[PDB]
Design an enzyme around this catalytic site. Structure first.
Site, PDB file in Angstrom:
ATOM      1  N   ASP A   1       0.833  -1.201   0.000  1.00 46.37           N
ATOM      2  CA  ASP A   1       0.000   0.000   0.000  1.00 46.37           C
ATOM      3  C   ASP A   1       0.871   1.257   0.000  1.00 46.37           C
ATOM      4  O   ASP A   1       1.614   1.485   0.957  1.00 46.37           O
ATOM      5  CB  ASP A   1      -0.910   0.022   1.229  1.00 46.37           C
ATOM      6  CG  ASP A   1      -1.917   1.152   1.185  1.00 46.37           C
ATOM      7  OD1 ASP A   1      -2.885   1.025   0.419  1.00 46.37           O
ATOM      8  OD2 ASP A   1      -1.726   2.168   1.895  1.00 46.37           O
TER       9      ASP A   1
ATOM     10  N   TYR B   1       2.477   9.926  -0.235  1.00 43.83           N
ATOM     11  CA  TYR B   1       3.549   9.441   0.629  1.00 43.83           C
ATOM     12  C   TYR B   1       4.922   9.870   0.164  1.00 43.83           C
ATOM     13  O   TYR B   1       5.887   9.645   0.900  1.00 43.83           O
ATOM     14  CB  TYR B   1       3.520   7.920   0.751  1.00 43.83           C
ATOM     15  CG  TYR B   1       2.204   7.430   1.314  1.00 43.83           C
ATOM     16  CD1 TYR B   1       1.320   8.321   1.920  1.00 43.83           C
ATOM     17  CD2 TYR B   1       1.833   6.103   1.223  1.00 43.83           C
ATOM     18  CE1 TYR B   1       0.101   7.895   2.415  1.00 43.83           C
ATOM     19  CE2 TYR B   1       0.613   5.667   1.718  1.00 43.83           C
ATOM     20  CZ  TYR B   1      -0.250   6.578   2.324  1.00 43.83           C
ATOM     21  OH  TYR B   1      -1.483   6.172   2.824  1.00 43.83           O
TER      22      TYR B   1
ATOM     23  N   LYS C   1      -2.900   5.810  -4.645  1.00 46.62           N
ATOM     24  CA  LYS C   1      -4.029   6.656  -4.292  1.00 46.62           C
ATOM     25  C   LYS C   1      -3.939   8.012  -4.973  1.00 46.62           C
ATOM     26  O   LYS C   1      -2.856   8.608  -5.077  1.00 46.62           O
ATOM     27  CB  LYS C   1      -4.121   6.847  -2.773  1.00 46.62           C
ATOM     28  CG  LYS C   1      -4.093   5.526  -1.951  1.00 46.62           C
ATOM     29  CD  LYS C   1      -4.471   5.795  -0.510  1.00 46.62           C
ATOM     30  CE  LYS C   1      -4.173   4.593   0.361  1.00 46.62           C
ATOM     31  NZ  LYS C   1      -2.695   4.461   0.587  1.00 46.62           N
TER      32      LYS C   1
ATOM     33  N   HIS D   1      -8.150   9.098  -2.385  1.00 43.79           N
ATOM     34  CA  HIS D   1      -7.459   9.033  -1.099  1.00 43.79           C
ATOM     35  C   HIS D   1      -8.280   9.657   0.027  1.00 43.79           C
ATOM     36  O   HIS D   1      -8.272   9.162   1.162  1.00 43.79           O
ATOM     37  CB  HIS D   1      -6.099   9.733  -1.227  1.00 43.79           C
ATOM     38  CG  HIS D   1      -5.104   9.374  -0.160  1.00 43.79           C
ATOM     39  ND1 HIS D   1      -3.750   9.558  -0.333  1.00 43.79           N
ATOM     40  CD2 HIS D   1      -5.257   8.878   1.091  1.00 43.79           C
ATOM     41  CE1 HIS D   1      -3.110   9.179   0.759  1.00 43.79           C
ATOM     42  NE2 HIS D   1      -4.000   8.761   1.640  1.00 43.79           N
TER      43      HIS D   1
ATOM     44  N   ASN E   1     -11.336   6.610   3.306  1.00 48.08           N
ATOM     45  CA  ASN E   1     -11.837   7.724   4.128  1.00 48.08           C
ATOM     46  C   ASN E   1     -13.209   8.220   3.660  1.00 48.08           C
ATOM     47  O   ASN E   1     -13.533   9.407   3.777  1.00 48.08           O
ATOM     48  CB  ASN E   1     -10.833   8.889   4.146  1.00 48.08           C
ATOM     49  CG  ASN E   1      -9.492   8.497   4.711  1.00 48.08           C
ATOM     50  OD1 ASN E   1      -8.446   8.621   4.044  1.00 48.08           O
ATOM     51  ND2 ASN E   1      -9.503   8.010   5.945  1.00 48.08           N
TER      52      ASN E   1
ATOM     53  N   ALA F   1      -3.862  -0.006  11.773  1.00 43.07           N
ATOM     54  CA  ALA F   1      -4.379  -1.170  12.484  1.00 43.07           C
ATOM     55  C   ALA F   1      -3.550  -1.520  13.713  1.00 43.07           C
ATOM     56  O   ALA F   1      -4.019  -2.289  14.556  1.00 43.07           O
ATOM     57  CB  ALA F   1      -4.431  -2.370  11.540  1.00 43.07           C
TER      58      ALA F   1
ATOM     59  N   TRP G   1      -0.557  15.290  13.304  1.00 43.24           N
ATOM     60  CA  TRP G   1      -1.674  14.552  12.728  1.00 43.24           C
ATOM     61  C   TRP G   1      -2.442  13.750  13.768  1.00 43.24           C
ATOM     62  O   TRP G   1      -3.665  13.592  13.645  1.00 43.24           O
ATOM     63  CB  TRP G   1      -1.162  13.618  11.621  1.00 43.24           C
ATOM     64  CG  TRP G   1      -0.417  14.357  10.541  1.00 43.24           C
ATOM     65  CD1 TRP G   1       0.925  14.321  10.298  1.00 43.24           C
ATOM     66  CD2 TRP G   1      -0.973  15.271   9.588  1.00 43.24           C
ATOM     67  NE1 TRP G   1       1.235  15.143   9.244  1.00 43.24           N
ATOM     68  CE2 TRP G   1       0.089  15.736   8.786  1.00 43.24           C
ATOM     69  CE3 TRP G   1      -2.267  15.727   9.324  1.00 43.24           C
ATOM     70  CZ2 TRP G   1      -0.102  16.645   7.747  1.00 43.24           C
ATOM     71  CZ3 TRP G   1      -2.457  16.625   8.285  1.00 43.24           C
ATOM     72  CH2 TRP G   1      -1.377  17.077   7.512  1.00 43.24           C
TER      73      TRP G   1
ATOM     74  N   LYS H   1       2.158  -1.305   8.807  1.00 45.17           N
ATOM     75  CA  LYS H   1       3.416  -0.639   8.484  1.00 45.17           C
ATOM     76  C   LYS H   1       4.493  -1.019   9.490  1.00 45.17           C
ATOM     77  O   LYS H   1       4.263  -0.957  10.700  1.00 45.17           O
ATOM     78  CB  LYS H   1       3.279   0.884   8.466  1.00 45.17           C
ATOM     79  CG  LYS H   1       4.588   1.607   8.079  1.00 45.17           C
ATOM     80  CD  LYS H   1       5.357   2.130   9.295  1.00 45.17           C
ATOM     81  CE  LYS H   1       6.556   3.016   8.924  1.00 45.17           C
ATOM     82  NZ  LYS H   1       7.429   3.206  10.141  1.00 45.17           N
TER      83      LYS H   1
ATOM     84  N   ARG I   1      10.210  -6.655  13.086  1.00 44.21           N
ATOM     85  CA  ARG I   1       8.757  -6.523  13.146  1.00 44.21           C
ATOM     86  C   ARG I   1       8.114  -6.841  11.795  1.00 44.21           C
ATOM     87  O   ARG I   1       7.041  -7.455  11.751  1.00 44.21           O
ATOM     88  CB  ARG I   1       8.380  -5.120  13.645  1.00 44.21           C
ATOM     89  CG  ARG I   1       8.830  -4.882  15.091  1.00 44.21           C
ATOM     90  CD  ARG I   1       8.320  -3.578  15.713  1.00 44.21           C
ATOM     91  NE  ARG I   1       9.058  -2.388  15.276  1.00 44.21           N
ATOM     92  CZ  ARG I   1      10.181  -1.934  15.830  1.00 44.21           C
ATOM     93  NH1 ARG I   1      10.745  -2.568  16.851  1.00 44.21           N
ATOM     94  NH2 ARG I   1      10.753  -0.834  15.358  1.00 44.21           N
ATOM     95  N   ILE I   2       8.764  -6.458  10.689  1.00 45.44           N
ATOM     96  CA  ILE I   2       8.259  -6.812   9.357  1.00 45.44           C
ATOM     97  C   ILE I   2       8.066  -8.315   9.266  1.00 45.44           C
ATOM     98  O   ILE I   2       6.987  -8.807   8.917  1.00 45.44           O
ATOM     99  CB  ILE I   2       9.211  -6.313   8.252  1.00 45.44           C
ATOM    100  CG1 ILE I   2       9.184  -4.794   8.131  1.00 45.44           C
ATOM    101  CG2 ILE I   2       8.834  -6.925   6.891  1.00 45.44           C
ATOM    102  CD1 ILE I   2      10.232  -4.247   7.139  1.00 45.44           C
ATOM    103  N   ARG I   3       9.120  -9.064   9.607  1.00 48.23           N
ATOM    104  CA  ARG I   3       9.050 -10.517   9.615  1.00 48.23           C
ATOM    105  C   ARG I   3       8.080 -11.028  10.674  1.00 48.23           C
ATOM    106  O   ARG I   3       7.439 -12.065  10.480  1.00 48.23           O
ATOM    107  CB  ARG I   3      10.448 -11.094   9.839  1.00 48.23           C
ATOM    108  CG  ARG I   3      11.455 -10.714   8.754  1.00 48.23           C
ATOM    109  CD  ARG I   3      12.853 -11.164   9.148  1.00 48.23           C
ATOM    110  NE  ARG I   3      12.961 -12.613   9.144  1.00 48.23           N
ATOM    111  CZ  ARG I   3      13.126 -13.346   8.046  1.00 48.23           C
ATOM    112  NH1 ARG I   3      13.196 -12.757   6.860  1.00 48.23           N
ATOM    113  NH2 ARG I   3      13.216 -14.667   8.133  1.00 48.23           N
TER     114      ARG I   3
END
Ligand SMILES: NC(=O)c1ccc[n+]([C@@H]2O[C@H](COP(=O)([O-])OP(=O)(O)OC[C@H]3O[C@@H](n4cnc5c(N)ncnc54)[C@H](OP(=O)(O)O)[C@@H]3O)[C@@H](O)[C@H]2O)c1
Ligand SMILES: O=C1C[C@@H](c2ccc(O)cc2)Oc2cc(O)ccc21
Length: 320
Positions: A47, A52, A81, A114, A164, A215, A224, A267, A273-275
């Site tokens: 994504d 970005y 997006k 987006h 959104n 998530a 933000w 993300k 953490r990715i793995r």
């Protein structure tokens, strides 16, 4: 694993996806490395967005994993997006072609509107007047969607969707005269503190996949996200279920979405953490544990996009 959900146009979407946004202060080069590591770990759904400012890097990563033979293009599900500065119909295809050029890919798997609030056309993604307020624009999002539909006609996007959008805006697209393609998905914030039960049921009712963003509780980038909001991954129930299952709070939070019919993004620019996050397929929550996580719902929206409030299209004023 590689398990997918069939979209309402017949394409298949991997149920776990890799988020590629990082805060502005994160150098662009870090997107290139993280996306390669995501693909090596097992991620096939990736994504991004023109917002970005990373599509050159994310494209470089994907095409390097194709070049070394790890994956073929058909194995990768890539999302981009359309940003608010190109909602105007005549600017939609230019924006998609600009993303594809940055990516050096012939097509995206999924192209999303987006955010339903329009801003002044131009190079600047958040144009501002002399008092610091956003220079909003007035566009008919139904005319935007028709131009996005033409992008599917042209084969530049295999599927198309929204992000959104509230129920009212979903209905505006779904009931538009002459609608060619329903949105395949609505990508919205979703986590145990904002579980979107009502919007999730409504999408399900119209054959629209809910794709959960933030998530794991969001990047929490100022200005933000409110820094005084609770931190999702510190939640005692998520942490207790992680101990019980020999997993992590992030993995409980992602497994939660998988078992309730939601496509979930995650993300991480961290190799471990990715793995870790791909391990969401190795275990199951009991129905009693799902209900315990249901109870965490707090109405804590991390990403209000407050700076865009005021116009009629600001999506978060409605209940859902
Ligand atoms: N409007 C939109 O459509 C929209 C808005 C927001 C997000 N999104 C999409 O959704 C993606 C995910 O949302 P997000 O960027 O807000 O972030 P997120 O997925 O909610 O979580 C990211 C944060 O959690 C950390 N994290 C990741 N894996 C972890 C793990 N296993 N254990 C502990 N911490 C972990 C990350 O740090 P590390 O990186 O150091 O691991 C980062 O600080 C975005 O990248 C973007 O692709 C879309
Ligand atoms: O974290 C945010 C806040 C905001 C935003 C991010 C970056 C930016 O340059 C301007 C606004 O909207 C978003 C949209 C996204 O898809 C991903 C993340 C964010």
């Amino acid at each position: 694993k590689y398990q997918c959900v069939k979209l309402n146009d017949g394409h298949f979407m991997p149920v776990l996806g890799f988020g590629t946004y990082a805060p502005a202060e994160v150098p662009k080069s870090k997107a290139l490395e993280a996306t390669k590591l995501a693909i090596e770990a097992g991620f096939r759904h990736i994504d991004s967005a023109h917002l970005y400012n990373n599509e050159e890097q994310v494209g470089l990563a994907i095409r390097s994993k194709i070049a070394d033979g790890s994956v073929k293009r058909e194995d990768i599900f890539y999302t981009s997006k359309l940003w608010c500065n190109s909602h105007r119909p005549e600017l939609v295809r230019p924006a998609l072609e600009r993303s594809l050029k940055n990516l050096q890919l012939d097509y995206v798997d999924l192209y999303l509107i987006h955010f339903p609030v329009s801003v002044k056309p131009g190079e600047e993604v958040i144009p501002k007047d002399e008092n610091g307020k956003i220079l909003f624009d007035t566009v008919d999002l139904c005319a935007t969607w028709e131009a996005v539909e033409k992008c599917k006609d042209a084969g530049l996007a295999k599927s198309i969707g929204v992000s959104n959008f509230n129920r009212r805006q979903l209905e505006m697209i779904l009931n538009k005269p002459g609608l060619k393609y329903k949105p395949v998905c609505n990508q919205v914030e979703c986590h145990p503190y904002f579980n979107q039960r009502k919007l999730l049921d409504f999408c399900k009712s119209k054959d629209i996949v809910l794709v959960a963003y933030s998530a794991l509780g969001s990047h929490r980038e100022e200005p933000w996200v409110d820094p005084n909001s609770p931190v999702l991954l510190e939640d005692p129930v998520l942490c207790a279920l992680a101990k019980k299952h020999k997993r992590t709070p992030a993995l409980i939070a992602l497994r939660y979405q998988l078992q309730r019919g939601v496509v979930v993004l995650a993300k991480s620019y961290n190799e471990q953490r990715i793995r870790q996050n791909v391990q969401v397929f190795e275990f199951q929550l009991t129905s009693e544990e799902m209900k315990a996580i249901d109870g965490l719902n707090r109405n804590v929206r991390y990403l209000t996009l407050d700076i865009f409030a005021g116009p009629p299209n600001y999506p978060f004023s409605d209940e859902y």
